[PDB]
Amino acid sequence: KVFGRCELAAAMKRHGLDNYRGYSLGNWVCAAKFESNFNTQATNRNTDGSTDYGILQINSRWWCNDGRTPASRNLCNIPCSALLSSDITASVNCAKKIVSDGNGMNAWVAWRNRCKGTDVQAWIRGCRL
Structure with a gap:
């Protein structure tokens, strides 16, 4: 599923991500945007043989089992x-x-390189939350 910006913001908020460990909602939405372009089915393989999965591109080396890492x-x-x-x-x-x-x-490398220190608040602008 390819999420809309505000649609994702609301689902993330509902799941307790707004301000989780001090990271406002805009950070999470910005991270999803650049990690997967809001696509839940995104996968990307890495040089070490591991693979990143989903909306937040979670790595198989440490976080999930794909049976081939x-x-x-x-x-x-x-x-x-x-x-x-x-x-x-x-x-x-x-x-x-x-x-x-x-x-x-x-x-999240995309967060560090493209969201960190930016006005992440823009990512939830205009949304009914």
């Missing part, structure tokens, strides 16, 4: 395909564990 850890304890669902609940629950890991949102 060298040295995977499956910290969120879910098959990676669960992260490609139209229902973002799994992606949100796993993202919550990732952001609490210590590096905060820096774990």
Whole structure:
């Protein structure tokens, strides 16, 4: 499913992401935009053989099991395909564990390079939340 900007903001808000660990909703929406372009089915393979999955491009080396990644850890304890669902609940629950890991949102390279230090508030502008 390809989410609309405001549509995603509301689902994320409903799932408790607004201000989770101090990151306002705009940060999460901006991250989704640049990580997957709001597409739940996005996948991208990496040089180390791992693959990123879903709306928030969660990596298979540490967070989910795809059955084909060298040295995977499956910290969120879910098959990676669960992260490609139209229902973002799994992606949100796993993202919550990732952001609490210590590096905060820096774990998402697109966030670090394209959202961090920008007016992320623009991403929820005009939405009925």
